[PDB]
Amino acid sequence: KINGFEVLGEVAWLWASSPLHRKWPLSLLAINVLPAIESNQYVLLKRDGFPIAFCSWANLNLENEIKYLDDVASLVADDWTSGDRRWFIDWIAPFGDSAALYKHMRDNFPNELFRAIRVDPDSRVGKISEFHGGKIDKKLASKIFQQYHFELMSELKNKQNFKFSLVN
Amino acid sequence: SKKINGFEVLGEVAWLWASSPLHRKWPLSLLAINVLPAIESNQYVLLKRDGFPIAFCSWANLNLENEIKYLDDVASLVADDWTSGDRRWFIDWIAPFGDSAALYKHMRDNFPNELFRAIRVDPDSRVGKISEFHGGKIDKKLASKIFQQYHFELMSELKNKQNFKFSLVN
């Protein structure tokens, strides 16, 4: 827990050294980082006692995956262990150390699969990227991803049918 | 470990900002600007209760030049400015769980002979309200004399700065 604050401080410093994250509000740091630390679902790489790279992941059920994709700031701590659909909540390496982070994930989570969303605010389009550990079979990974995707798309479309406009 | 202590303190402060209705909306860049030099210069107080932080304040010891630079842009100070003179300013004051009186008392009793100012920008007014704080062993009459001088020195130099903004070419 003293450890906890120390990690939080490092991550804050690393956000502050990152061109986009430095502009984000402290509310989003608490939302994205406290549960990562509490659940230990993060990797923090350091050099010379300073942080250089950080990624975190939430293990979601489908309900929470849809909630997150509707609003990236909506997860609460309990959601982070709510299922088996893994999402990278943050992935930063502002000083050029991304390959080291990538490798660390590849080797330490060799049979895991993760997705991430990136949003372009000028088109309002979000894209989903896929990542998998270093030992898991390419064909099997690609099939698990296809299944995740089909489940997500089908549930989104179902929810699309109930959507409406609010008017006085 | 000098800087693991540093990160620890920075995390505690960040947590405190995140618990505060206004500070939680401020950016991480402002946290680094306001908090890293406080920690480096040790010009802060962090109150804790049961091993959790509850309140934090920091201060910069400015010269008149940096005071003016700060009041024109509250995010403009750099670390060296924090020890640049004897005009003390509270840079942060946060106590999101209701412990502001406790900070106040701690400062009053532990900095009994010090004077500090703080600026709050209204906001429904476009006016900054400058508040004046003094330690418990400074009497009122004395505090008020020193503050009046600080203020007159600030106002005069703000006016005189206008003369250097522009030249006319015709």
Swiss-Prot record, chain B:
One of its GO terms (cellular component) is cytoplasm. Homodimer. It comes from Actinobacillus pleuropneumoniae (Haemophilus pleuropneumoniae). Changing H23A: Strongly reduced protein-lysine acyltransferase activity. Changing G11A: Does not affect homodimerization. Belongs to the RTX toxin acyltransferase family. Protein-lysine acyltransferase that catalyzes fatty acylation of the protoxin, thereby converting it to the active toxin. This is RTX-I toxin-activating lysine-acyltransferase ApxIC. Coiled coil: none annotated. GO terms for biological process: killing of cells of another organism; toxin metabolic process.
